[PDB]
PDB file of C-alpha atoms (C1' of nucleotides) in Angstrom:
ATOM      1  CA  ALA A   1      -6.571  13.262  -7.454  1.00  0.00           C
ATOM      2  CA  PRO A   2      -2.777  13.700  -6.899  1.00  0.00           C
ATOM      3  CA  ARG A   3      -2.665  10.284  -4.635  1.00  0.00           C
ATOM      4  CA  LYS A   4      -1.074  10.654  -1.389  1.00  0.00           C
ATOM      5  CA  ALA A   5       2.220   9.521   0.568  1.00  0.00           C
ATOM      6  CA  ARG A   6       2.770   5.980   1.369  1.00  0.00           C
ATOM      7  CA  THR A   7       3.310   5.179   4.761  1.00  0.00           C
ATOM      8  CA  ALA A   8       6.196   3.216   6.171  1.00  0.00           C
ATOM      9  CA  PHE A   9       4.421   2.286   9.499  1.00  0.00           C
ATOM     10  CA  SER A  10       7.315   2.149  11.929  1.00  0.00           C
ATOM     11  CA  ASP A  11       7.972  -2.152  13.524  1.00  0.00           C
ATOM     12  CA  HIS A  12       6.300  -0.749  16.869  1.00  0.00           C
ATOM     13  CA  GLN A  13       3.278   0.063  14.599  1.00  0.00           C
ATOM     14  CA  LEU A  14       2.638  -3.026  12.183  1.00  0.00           C
ATOM     15  CA  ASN A  15       3.538  -5.276  15.366  1.00  0.00           C
ATOM     16  CA  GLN A  16       1.114  -3.903  17.227  1.00  0.00           C
ATOM     17  CA  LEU A  17      -1.441  -3.583  13.898  1.00  0.00           C
ATOM     18  CA  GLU A  18      -0.264  -7.739  13.570  1.00  0.00           C
ATOM     19  CA  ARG A  19      -0.791  -7.770  17.054  1.00  0.00           C
ATOM     20  CA  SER A  20      -4.606  -6.453  16.908  1.00  0.00           C
ATOM     21  CA  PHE A  21      -5.315  -8.391  13.623  1.00  0.00           C
ATOM     22  CA  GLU A  22      -4.543 -11.647  15.576  1.00  0.00           C
ATOM     23  CA  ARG A  23      -6.741 -10.543  18.113  1.00  0.00           C
ATOM     24  CA  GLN A  24      -9.471  -9.413  16.110  1.00  0.00           C
ATOM     25  CA  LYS A  25      -9.770  -9.721  11.975  1.00  0.00           C
ATOM     26  CA  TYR A  26     -12.818  -6.685  12.526  1.00  0.00           C
ATOM     27  CA  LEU A  27     -12.463  -4.109  14.603  1.00  0.00           C
ATOM     28  CA  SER A  28     -15.603  -1.139  16.256  1.00  0.00           C
ATOM     29  CA  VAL A  29     -15.782   1.845  15.619  1.00  0.00           C
ATOM     30  CA  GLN A  30     -14.225   2.377  18.976  1.00  0.00           C
ATOM     31  CA  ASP A  31     -11.711  -0.333  18.432  1.00  0.00           C
ATOM     32  CA  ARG A  32     -10.325   1.088  15.445  1.00  0.00           C
ATOM     33  CA  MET A  33      -9.351   4.797  17.210  1.00  0.00           C
ATOM     34  CA  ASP A  34      -7.923   3.933  20.318  1.00  0.00           C
ATOM     35  CA  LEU A  35      -5.591   1.448  18.047  1.00  0.00           C
ATOM     36  CA  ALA A  36      -4.770   4.682  15.584  1.00  0.00           C
ATOM     37  CA  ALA A  37      -4.546   7.187  18.663  1.00  0.00           C
ATOM     38  CA  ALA A  38      -2.387   4.594  20.700  1.00  0.00           C
ATOM     39  CA  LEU A  39       0.179   4.170  17.066  1.00  0.00           C
ATOM     40  CA  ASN A  40      -0.261   8.165  16.325  1.00  0.00           C
ATOM     41  CA  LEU A  41      -1.851   7.203  13.216  1.00  0.00           C
ATOM     42  CA  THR A  42      -5.455   8.298  11.742  1.00  0.00           C
ATOM     43  CA  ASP A  43      -8.635   5.965  12.109  1.00  0.00           C
ATOM     44  CA  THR A  44      -8.118   5.877   7.636  1.00  0.00           C
ATOM     45  CA  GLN A  45      -4.571   4.236   8.322  1.00  0.00           C
ATOM     46  CA  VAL A  46      -6.052   2.015  10.528  1.00  0.00           C
ATOM     47  CA  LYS A  47      -8.488   1.220   8.179  1.00  0.00           C
ATOM     48  CA  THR A  48      -6.670   1.085   5.077  1.00  0.00           C
ATOM     49  CA  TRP A  49      -4.137  -1.112   6.855  1.00  0.00           C
ATOM     50  CA  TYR A  50      -7.019  -3.904   8.159  1.00  0.00           C
ATOM     51  CA  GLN A  51      -9.263  -4.047   5.148  1.00  0.00           C
ATOM     52  CA  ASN A  52      -5.387  -4.616   2.660  1.00  0.00           C
ATOM     53  CA  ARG A  53      -4.744  -7.162   6.168  1.00  0.00           C
ATOM     54  CA  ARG A  54      -7.806  -8.723   5.563  1.00  0.00           C
ATOM     55  CA  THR A  55      -7.578  -9.084   1.637  1.00  0.00           C
ATOM     56  CA  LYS A  56      -4.039 -10.860   1.951  1.00  0.00           C
ATOM     57  CA  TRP A  57      -5.460 -13.333   5.147  1.00  0.00           C
ATOM     58  CA  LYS A  58      -7.965 -14.154   2.281  1.00  0.00           C
ATOM     59  CA  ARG A  59      -5.445 -14.739   0.220  1.00  0.00           C
ATOM     60  CA  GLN A  60      -3.577 -17.355   2.799  1.00  0.00           C
ATOM     61  CA  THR A  61      -7.243 -18.776   3.449  1.00  0.00           C
ATOM     62  CA  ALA A  62      -7.154 -19.818  -0.504  1.00  0.00           C
ATOM     63  CA  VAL A  63      -3.652 -20.842  -0.268  1.00  0.00           C
ATOM     64  CA  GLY A  64      -4.670 -23.782   1.719  1.00  0.00           C
TER      65      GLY A  64
ATOM     66  CA  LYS B   1     -22.497  21.968   4.335  1.00  0.00           C
ATOM     67  CA  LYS B   2     -23.487  20.235   1.068  1.00  0.00           C
ATOM     68  CA  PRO B   3     -27.033  20.830   0.331  1.00  0.00           C
ATOM     69  CA  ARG B   4     -29.476  17.324   0.599  1.00  0.00           C
ATOM     70  CA  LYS B   5     -29.804  16.255  -3.293  1.00  0.00           C
ATOM     71  CA  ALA B   6     -33.537  17.093  -4.564  1.00  0.00           C
ATOM     72  CA  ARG B   7     -35.805  13.728  -3.929  1.00  0.00           C
ATOM     73  CA  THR B   8     -36.202  12.347  -7.495  1.00  0.00           C
ATOM     74  CA  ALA B   9     -39.594  12.025  -8.507  1.00  0.00           C
ATOM     75  CA  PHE B  10     -39.414   8.811 -11.018  1.00  0.00           C
ATOM     76  CA  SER B  11     -42.434   8.961 -13.693  1.00  0.00           C
ATOM     77  CA  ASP B  12     -44.843   5.266 -14.157  1.00  0.00           C
ATOM     78  CA  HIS B  13     -42.681   4.478 -17.333  1.00  0.00           C
ATOM     79  CA  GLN B  14     -39.445   5.219 -15.412  1.00  0.00           C
ATOM     80  CA  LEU B  15     -40.780   3.463 -12.650  1.00  0.00           C
ATOM     81  CA  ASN B  16     -42.357   0.194 -14.565  1.00  0.00           C
ATOM     82  CA  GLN B  17     -39.219  -0.062 -16.305  1.00  0.00           C
ATOM     83  CA  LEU B  18     -37.015   0.157 -13.261  1.00  0.00           C
ATOM     84  CA  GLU B  19     -39.245  -2.741 -12.026  1.00  0.00           C
ATOM     85  CA  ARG B  20     -38.726  -4.909 -15.197  1.00  0.00           C
ATOM     86  CA  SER B  21     -35.291  -4.758 -14.431  1.00  0.00           C
ATOM     87  CA  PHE B  22     -35.090  -5.394 -11.518  1.00  0.00           C
ATOM     88  CA  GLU B  23     -37.791  -8.640 -11.848  1.00  0.00           C
ATOM     89  CA  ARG B  24     -34.686 -10.237 -14.565  1.00  0.00           C
ATOM     90  CA  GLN B  25     -31.901  -8.947 -12.662  1.00  0.00           C
ATOM     91  CA  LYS B  26     -30.923  -8.035  -9.336  1.00  0.00           C
ATOM     92  CA  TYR B  27     -27.319  -7.032  -9.834  1.00  0.00           C
ATOM     93  CA  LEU B  28     -26.757  -4.669 -13.323  1.00  0.00           C
ATOM     94  CA  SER B  29     -23.188  -4.737 -14.615  1.00  0.00           C
ATOM     95  CA  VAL B  30     -22.063  -0.985 -15.116  1.00  0.00           C
ATOM     96  CA  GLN B  31     -23.086  -1.170 -19.153  1.00  0.00           C
ATOM     97  CA  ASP B  32     -26.659  -2.210 -18.322  1.00  0.00           C
ATOM     98  CA  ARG B  33     -26.552   0.946 -15.394  1.00  0.00           C
ATOM     99  CA  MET B  34     -25.614   3.250 -18.468  1.00  0.00           C
ATOM    100  CA  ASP B  35     -27.781   1.798 -20.538  1.00  0.00           C
ATOM    101  CA  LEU B  36     -30.742   1.562 -18.994  1.00  0.00           C
ATOM    102  CA  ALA B  37     -30.134   5.476 -17.658  1.00  0.00           C
ATOM    103  CA  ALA B  38     -30.467   6.607 -20.713  1.00  0.00           C
ATOM    104  CA  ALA B  39     -33.015   4.535 -21.819  1.00  0.00           C
ATOM    105  CA  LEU B  40     -34.776   6.254 -19.050  1.00  0.00           C
ATOM    106  CA  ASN B  41     -33.389   9.737 -19.067  1.00  0.00           C
ATOM    107  CA  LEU B  42     -31.931   9.547 -16.423  1.00  0.00           C
ATOM    108  CA  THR B  43     -27.857   9.917 -14.774  1.00  0.00           C
ATOM    109  CA  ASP B  44     -26.416   6.549 -14.005  1.00  0.00           C
ATOM    110  CA  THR B  45     -26.801   7.400  -9.947  1.00  0.00           C
ATOM    111  CA  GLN B  46     -30.600   7.512  -9.847  1.00  0.00           C
ATOM    112  CA  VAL B  47     -30.641   4.241 -11.411  1.00  0.00           C
ATOM    113  CA  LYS B  48     -27.701   2.546  -9.166  1.00  0.00           C
ATOM    114  CA  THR B  49     -29.230   4.187  -6.125  1.00  0.00           C
ATOM    115  CA  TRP B  50     -32.808   2.555  -6.777  1.00  0.00           C
ATOM    116  CA  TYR B  51     -31.429  -0.503  -7.728  1.00  0.00           C
ATOM    117  CA  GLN B  52     -29.957  -0.745  -4.440  1.00  0.00           C
ATOM    118  CA  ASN B  53     -32.780   0.379  -2.434  1.00  0.00           C
ATOM    119  CA  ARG B  54     -34.628  -2.085  -4.427  1.00  0.00           C
ATOM    120  CA  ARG B  55     -32.863  -4.808  -3.105  1.00  0.00           C
ATOM    121  CA  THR B  56     -33.318  -3.782   0.169  1.00  0.00           C
ATOM    122  CA  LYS B  57     -36.833  -3.656  -0.282  1.00  0.00           C
ATOM    123  CA  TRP B  58     -36.495  -6.822  -1.689  1.00  0.00           C
ATOM    124  CA  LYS B  59     -34.811  -8.307   1.085  1.00  0.00           C
ATOM    125  CA  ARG B  60     -37.624  -7.074   3.495  1.00  0.00           C
ATOM    126  CA  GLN B  61     -39.756  -9.145   1.022  1.00  0.00           C
ATOM    127  CA  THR B  62     -37.960 -12.803   0.342  1.00  0.00           C
ATOM    128  CA  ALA B  63     -36.967 -12.355   4.668  1.00  0.00           C
TER     129      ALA B  63
ATOM    130  C1'  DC C   1       4.691  -6.792  -0.751  1.00  0.00           C
ATOM    131  C1'  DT C   2       1.873  -3.369   0.997  1.00  0.00           C
ATOM    132  C1'  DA C   3      -0.172   1.598   1.312  1.00  0.00           C
ATOM    133  C1'  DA C   4      -3.762   3.997  -1.084  1.00  0.00           C
ATOM    134  C1'  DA C   5      -7.369   4.448  -4.611  1.00  0.00           C
ATOM    135  C1'  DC C   6     -11.293   2.871  -6.728  1.00  0.00           C
ATOM    136  C1'  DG C   7     -16.563   1.808  -7.716  1.00  0.00           C
ATOM    137  C1'  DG C   8     -20.016  -0.933  -6.196  1.00  0.00           C
ATOM    138  C1'  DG C   9     -22.549  -3.555  -2.640  1.00  0.00           C
ATOM    139  C1'  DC C  10     -24.853  -3.305   1.771  1.00  0.00           C
ATOM    140  C1'  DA C  11     -26.183  -1.847   6.062  1.00  0.00           C
ATOM    141  C1'  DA C  12     -28.613   1.792   8.746  1.00  0.00           C
ATOM    142  C1'  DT C  13     -30.578   5.872   9.116  1.00  0.00           C
ATOM    143  C1'  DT C  14     -32.637  10.456   6.600  1.00  0.00           C
ATOM    144  C1'  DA C  15     -35.915  12.902   5.596  1.00  0.00           C
ATOM    145  C1'  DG C  16     -39.661  14.774   1.201  1.00  0.00           C
TER     146       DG C  16
ATOM    147  C1'  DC D   1     -42.859   4.589   1.249  1.00  0.00           C
ATOM    148  C1'  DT D   2     -38.638   5.530  -0.777  1.00  0.00           C
ATOM    149  C1'  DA D   3     -34.741   8.804  -2.538  1.00  0.00           C
ATOM    150  C1'  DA D   4     -30.760   9.975  -0.654  1.00  0.00           C
ATOM    151  C1'  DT D   5     -26.816  10.325   2.280  1.00  0.00           C
ATOM    152  C1'  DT D   6     -23.770   7.715   5.648  1.00  0.00           C
ATOM    153  C1'  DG D   7     -19.261   4.976   7.157  1.00  0.00           C
ATOM    154  C1'  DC D   8     -17.735   0.543   5.856  1.00  0.00           C
ATOM    155  C1'  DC D   9     -16.505  -3.471   3.602  1.00  0.00           C
ATOM    156  C1'  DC D  10     -15.125  -6.088  -0.817  1.00  0.00           C
ATOM    157  C1'  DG D  11     -12.904  -6.995  -4.634  1.00  0.00           C
ATOM    158  C1'  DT D  12      -9.716  -4.905  -8.072  1.00  0.00           C
ATOM    159  C1'  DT D  13      -6.360  -2.168  -9.732  1.00  0.00           C
ATOM    160  C1'  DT D  14      -2.635   1.737  -8.589  1.00  0.00           C
ATOM    161  C1'  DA D  15       1.657   2.058  -7.266  1.00  0.00           C
ATOM    162  C1'  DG D  16       6.052   3.191  -3.778  1.00  0.00           C
TER     163       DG D  16
END
DNA sequence: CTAAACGGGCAATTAG
DNA sequence: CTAATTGCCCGTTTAG
């Protein structure tokens, strides 16, 4: 459908999402929702970030 | 809010053909799924669901 | 690059 | 039993 605005994450958001990702490649419902609340992102944003992050990760596992 | 869909009652024939499909191919390509639905006078979704349910059951058998 | 969108699968659940 | 519903993942594609 009409397609929704691309989020531009803040440096603090990107920092803490990279950290979480470093801590954990997958999140529970609970950790996800808490990381969302702590950064003022929606659950979905955080889920799509983590999922997009894995695609890149798998790429770096295929990068050697 | 969204009413639950009626539980499809497949005919003996539809089931036999679904089961024969599954015997050959656990997975259908899109095109194959469309053909088979059309073959059986079913919706693509009816067929996708069946196949999905079927692979579950079959995992319980292989198990 | 990467956020969001897309359809299909998986597991777990719901319910006819 | 099993058809349908849920939330998430994957892999791909779309596009800011």
